[PDB]
Design a protein around this ligand. Structure first.
Ligand SMILES: *C/C=C(\C)c1ccc(-c2ccc(N(C)C)cc2)s1
Length: 133
């Protein structure tokens, strides 16, 4: 299924700190952030997505249209400019962020009743699993 709508509550988090370090996020921010449970809220209507990543320490939102390139500032994550594109590879939602960092982006897919995602930067991969609330 390509339907990723919902409020998703984190069940599992692996190598979140490696991903943050590959983005050069500072020590203090990483050490606090790696401890935290995350929520992902996805509003999906056709190609149009609104995605919100939250914890007690951040609230990061992005809107996009599948298949439409968009210039993006990554704001309080790592304050960089990238050229972003989100597309479907089968039922995997794939984001590529072109810019200073190699292999930067993410992948999301539904597997069972859960949302799985990969966050990638450089040679680091963070793997997460969320349950639908
Ligand atoms: C589809 C998933 C997305 C866009 C994200 C998953 C995690 C994100 C994130 C983590 C940490 C921060 N800060 C500010 C530490 C921001 C966003 S976005």
């Amino acid at each position: 299924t390509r339907d990723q709508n919902g409020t998703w509550e984190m069940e599992s988090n692996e190598n979140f700190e490696g991903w943050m370090k590959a983005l050069d996020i500072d020590f203090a921010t990483r050490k606090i952030a790696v401890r935290l449970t995350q929520t992902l809220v996805i509003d999906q209507d056709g190609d149009n997505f609104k995605v919100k990543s939250t914890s007690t320490f951040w609230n990061y939102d992005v809107d996009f249209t599948v298949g439409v390139e968009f210039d993006e500032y990554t704001k309080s994550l790592d304050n960089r400019h990238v050229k972003a594109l989100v597309t479907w590879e089968g039922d995997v939602l794939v984001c590529v962020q072109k810019g200073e960092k190699e292999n930067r982006g993410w992948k999301k897919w539904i597997e069972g009743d859960k949302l799985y995602e990969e966050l990638t930067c450089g040679d680091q991969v963070c793997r997460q699993v969320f349950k639908k609330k």
